[PDB]
Enzyme design. Structure first.
Site, short mmCIF file in Angstrom:
data_model
loop_
_atom_site.label_atom_id
_atom_site.label_comp_id
_atom_site.label_asym_id
_atom_site.label_seq_id
_atom_site.Cartn_x
_atom_site.Cartn_y
_atom_site.Cartn_z
N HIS F 20 25.05 -24.33 -15.70
CA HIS F 20 24.80 -25.76 -15.87
C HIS F 20 25.96 -26.45 -16.59
O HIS F 20 26.29 -26.09 -17.72
CB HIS F 20 23.50 -25.96 -16.66
CG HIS F 20 23.03 -27.39 -16.71
ND1 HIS F 20 21.96 -27.79 -17.49
CD2 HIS F 20 23.45 -28.50 -16.06
CE1 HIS F 20 21.76 -29.08 -17.33
NE2 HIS F 20 22.65 -29.54 -16.46
N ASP F 28 43.02 -32.92 -2.48
CA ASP F 28 43.80 -33.18 -1.27
C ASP F 28 45.02 -32.27 -1.40
O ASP F 28 45.18 -31.59 -2.42
CB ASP F 28 44.18 -34.66 -1.16
CG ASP F 28 44.97 -35.17 -2.35
OD1 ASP F 28 44.76 -36.35 -2.73
OD2 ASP F 28 45.80 -34.43 -2.91
N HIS F 98 43.20 -41.97 -12.60
CA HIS F 98 43.66 -40.71 -12.03
C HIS F 98 44.25 -39.79 -13.09
O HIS F 98 44.19 -38.56 -12.96
CB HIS F 98 44.70 -40.98 -10.95
CG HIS F 98 45.23 -39.75 -10.28
ND1 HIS F 98 44.41 -38.88 -9.59
CD2 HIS F 98 46.48 -39.26 -10.17
CE1 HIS F 98 45.15 -37.91 -9.07
NE2 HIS F 98 46.41 -38.12 -9.41
N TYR F 120 44.56 -39.89 -3.42
CA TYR F 120 43.40 -39.82 -4.30
C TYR F 120 42.14 -39.22 -3.71
O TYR F 120 41.03 -39.49 -4.17
CB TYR F 120 43.10 -41.21 -4.86
CG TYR F 120 44.30 -41.82 -5.52
CD1 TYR F 120 45.04 -42.82 -4.89
CD2 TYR F 120 44.74 -41.36 -6.76
CE1 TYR F 120 46.18 -43.34 -5.47
CE2 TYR F 120 45.89 -41.87 -7.35
CZ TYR F 120 46.61 -42.86 -6.70
OH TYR F 120 47.75 -43.35 -7.26
N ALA F 121 42.32 -38.37 -2.71
CA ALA F 121 41.18 -37.73 -2.08
C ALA F 121 40.82 -36.48 -2.88
O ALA F 121 40.94 -35.36 -2.38
CB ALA F 121 41.50 -37.38 -0.64
N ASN F 122 40.42 -36.68 -4.14
CA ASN F 122 40.03 -35.57 -5.02
C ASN F 122 38.73 -35.94 -5.72
O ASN F 122 38.42 -37.12 -5.90
CB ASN F 122 41.07 -35.30 -6.11
CG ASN F 122 42.48 -35.28 -5.59
OD1 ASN F 122 43.22 -36.25 -5.75
ND2 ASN F 122 42.88 -34.17 -4.98
#
Ligand code: CL
Ligand code: CL
Ligand code: CL
Ligand code: CL
Lengths: 131, 131, 131, 131, 131, 131, 131, 131, 131, 131
Positions: F20, F28, F98, F120-122
């Site tokens: 947890h 990316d 970011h 920014y595809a994270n």
């Protein structure tokens, strides 16, 4: 600091683990060390430390029941050949061909490299027992 | 066999990686080695090899721009203190308290232990540059 | 910095450990390196550095008593094949089939990969002895 | 064999992991490499391979968004400073004191040692993005 | 970022070390990986990435001189068997019993696991030379 | 073969240890991976596999209680930004600069690199609990 | 947390790498584990967890195509012997002498130690394929 | 076999590396060993070997310049507390709270665990120098 | 602290993994330990701890089904031979030549070195089963 | 086999090293394990083994001088909270916020993961002394 025993930390560690019949090598500067065999290099410069000086120290700190050397040492290097014979007067001294000698170094626990720049100045000290 | 350079395999490896300002230590038999710092022990027996002999060899094989020693060496050990001064006549020689000196050994790449049995016979050789 | 010897740190470490008969390889950009054999890649771009240039440096820094190459070098790479014969004019030169050569590279202490982009530009340098 | 990309196997592995902002270093033969930073030594002999030649290859295989160098490179190396300005036209070129520079190399993914024997001939390439 | 070559970091490092005749495997989700062989798993979910797609990318980034597959692939998976034949038109395509194929995978430098869920969709790509 | 759960072996190992609040990263092709954080590269070629496809798989195999992304994604990558909101519509979605996002990736158990080639595809998946 | 599959993290890692024909061992508290084979001990106290309970979990999370056990189980442990026949009623069940069985455990990917305290309560699960 | 020095191999290795001011610990069966500190356990059964006996051997094999103990030893373990004062009559003896003592054990080169089953039977031996 | 079982932490770990038939060795101060076999040295000084004392503890904490010793123990150690016969009444006691014995120690999980300074005072304990 | 003590090999090794005040954790299937802390997962399936059963065995094999749990356990899981109180009647039972409890688990020598599927069923057992 350690009160007694050999002064070299690497060497003390090796002697510490010696069991009856284990082997160590004292080598001149040209002896190849088999893969997997620990190499403790004491060389400072050509001739130092000498094969003899090193052998004397190990003899004083290790119980040796047998010494092995390459027969070739008798031909090109009578100096060290007689030193080794006198130093280990009571122990068992066997000569093998240099080739066979090198094969045997595969079973050594370590190879101590000196600065000795003379032919076949190498030997195998085989551990004795204190009782 | 390697044609040129220092004869010691462990030492050659250390010198090989030396960059401008990296440090190595030449120590007497009692200098504690900081955790993490490689220890290359050349000692054979009390006094051998000597602090001086070892320092001479390293000086001939390493470009040194600075030597550091503990001020205490001047008090109890004038012999080696003057040897070091003459050997590195052109280099920068700085004295720190033995305590500060030991702190600095944390940044050494290795500590070379000799058989020198005299007080504060230790120094830090700081790498120079060949161009 | 290290004053004498080969400039490359990885290579110096390798030469440092050479004992009589130990072997190292100088390879072209395509030679396969057997598992467990250290690979020191000097390549910058196709052709750089050259087999010849690397062979020359190693010859100046290592005592070579024997050289071994693939017989296919004579037929497929005359330039580099004659270079070898010239550089190692005094050493014993033995040719084996490329397959046998590769088999032998398994015993090498390391394979130095060059940028050489010509067929069978590979050789094994067997260490000699300084005494 | 690998079809495209940089020829050096060690460098290829470094470039493979590069993410936006990761840094590599190209160094002359005297730059000290911080502990923990991988050192890929391409050096062959003094001068080879050259800082410029090496820097060019990396520019051709790596997307650089910024270049960092020591201000001392302009005073002690006017030529190599222009080369960088020219090579990385569209990139930001920042200058720092050599000291700050060295502190920066601690974050590098690796230091590529060239055979450059010219003062302060070092630089840090900061990876850009392909999208 | 890396400008050229295959996008996958794990794969890049593998291709980078490829020497003539080295081998890598492209496998379906069920192929067992021999002990000691690096496994690079690209699978995301059943069928993705496809054996064909993965095989195409590797064909574009690696110089293949030979392809090996199990004969059982012609019995149950003709689609992938035909794909492989056409992709490597010029190269040598050898079929072995699946059992023998698996024995050969032990020599592989790595096994790339795809998400392919069809029988015997595996192959060995043997590396060629760029000169 | 494993009957249930995510197909990727590397990924299964990461999920298996999830407790947890432990965090995971889907990135990316350009996101830098902090030192010490395991990198599981699934990239096949530019754009493959896609951030979205990778996210969907993880979402279905991992219980997620929160998702974190860079604010820069909302404007520079509206598509993948909408996707995230839709996929994790019931989870808490937090946006950070970011830079903050990257600092936060230091604590990740692993970074899963996709082939995504859009800025920014994270995102970070924070594990929830099944009870 | 991981949504699907076996609960034990250590076990999930083992299954994740399962390829067609890889083997796994469920053992009683006395079976010796060959050197080199990973031991995942689930034992809590004598009898817990039980061979049967452990077998049931693995059977439901691993695709099994064959089961191997020691013949000695049929007479010395009829209960657990019947169990095995019933649970893996559709799989191929082979019996070998306990000695052969043990030799066969050398190839296992892991030995899962249960708390089972009844003689010969061991078995080997050989992985099948999902396609 | 090793002729002189302490009989225990693990201990000899530790003494071998002692430099002036390095510390080691002799502990009772319950002292916690800080993470990273080597633990050499000599215990055979409750009470064996005894704190006293172990302290005596180490004193004969190591040059101790200072001894450190928990002040709680005086009040809770008179027998062992007076033993120490007697054995190390010439050394500087310093007492710290048990908590402070433990804190100091983090700097120890190793903790030698005895079978001593009496309260606070622990001490730190600080290495002296032979010159 | 651990409530039950053998007091020595190193031995406890060895016994914990013992499976039916695994073997441990109790050795005098001179038995050589084969490479790869863990050595747990309890020795304190010559004679301590004794072979017999150590052998008794292990018998009390380990289920032994068989004991192996060198025949030479009867001729060079009549006392210690009776002790074993008495201690392991219900166990099979096999005698081999010291040479065969040593070859057998290669399979041991560990060698427990005692301080016994008596000829051939060594034995191998072969674990039995608790059910 | 081992005659006394806890049955689990992994657990045995942990208990074996316990020194006064060392800590171990017994956790439910959701507790995150801090980086660097050995995780011994005993879980078989949801609910097994139970937090209570595991806690009972450890209470029987380890000398506990203190127990730590999160106060949240009294809110959602009174059953396990009462169990713990009665099991460790004499010992000190301290409650901390779950957050603080997790911070404390970083000092633990290990985290034993059970199959318990109920909220905050975790606790820290601090080791006591046998004398
Ligand atoms: Cl050199
Ligand atoms: Cl590449
Ligand atoms: Cl010693
Ligand atoms: Cl135990």
């Amino acid at each position: 600091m350690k009160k007694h025993g050999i002064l070299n930390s690497h060497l003390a560690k090796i002697l510490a683990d010696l069991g009856h019949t284990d082997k160590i090598v004292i080598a001149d500067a040209g002896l190849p060390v088999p893969d997997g065999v620990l190499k403790i290099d004491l060389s400072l410069k050509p001739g130092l430390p000498a094969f003899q000086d090193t052998a004397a120290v190990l003899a004083e700190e290790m119980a040796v029941e047998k010494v092995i050397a390459a027969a070739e040492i008798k031909a090109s290097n009578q100096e060290n050949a007689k030193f080794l014979e006198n130093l280990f007067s009571e122990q068992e001294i066997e000569y093998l061909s240099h080739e066979e000698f090198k094969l045997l170094t595969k079973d050594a626990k370590a190879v101590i490299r000196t600065g000795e720049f003379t032919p076949y100045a190498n030997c195998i000290l085989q551990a004795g027992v204190l009782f």
